[PDB]
Design a protein around this ligand. Structure first.
Ligand SMILES: CCCCc1cccnc1
Length: 161
């Protein structure tokens, strides 16, 4: 399911870390800030958790933030007039791949995937897979992008098994 998929892709860390882009993050891939200030990241963390955390959270707190973040990705898709029709055309496994991309890049980070979205809506899976890989996303995180792309290409969990 989407939670297991993203837990594999994001890992779990209970202290503030830096993501693949160098940005302060915690938990299961919860972005805190793009600011270079660790203090700014710590403030965001305390606001998110509701207590003074000192840069450290519990597993329960990480899982709670993760549920909120997955839901936010889903609701962002459903509120977006370009993403929603494609999402609604997909089967459940491919919908997980869609959520995964929005979780990683946000609605703004996927804005350039217009042609990929059309190919997905047309169910041209091999063509969509080729197009999805022609991206900064694929070049910078190729193993994760390959897993997501294989999920779109096949509609199976083969890349995560
Ligand atoms: C083109 C890839 C972006 C992920 C996605 C796919 C379908 C619907 N919403 C989001």
């Amino acid at each position: 399911n989407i939670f297991e998929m993203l837990r594999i892709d994001e890992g779990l860390r209970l202290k503030i870390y830096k993501d693949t882009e160098g940005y302060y993050t915690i938990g299961i891939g919860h972005l805190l800030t793009k600011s270079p200030s660790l203090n700014a990241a710590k403030s965001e963390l305390d606001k998110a958790i509701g207590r003074n955390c000192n840069g450290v959270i519990t597993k329960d707190e990480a899982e709670k933030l993760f549920n909120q973040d997955v839901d936010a990705a889903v609701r962002g898709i459903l509120r977006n007039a370009k993403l929603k029709p494609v999402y609604d055309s997909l089967d459940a496994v491919r919908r997980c791949a869609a959520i995964n991309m929005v979780f990683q890049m946000g609605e703004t980070g996927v804005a350039g995937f217009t042609n990929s979205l059309r190919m997905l809506q047309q169910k041209r899976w091999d063509e969509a897979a080729v197009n999805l890989a022609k991206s900064r996303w694929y070049n910078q995180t190729p193993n994760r992008a390959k897993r997501v792309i294989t999920t779109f290409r096949t509609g199976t969990w083969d890349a995560y098994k």
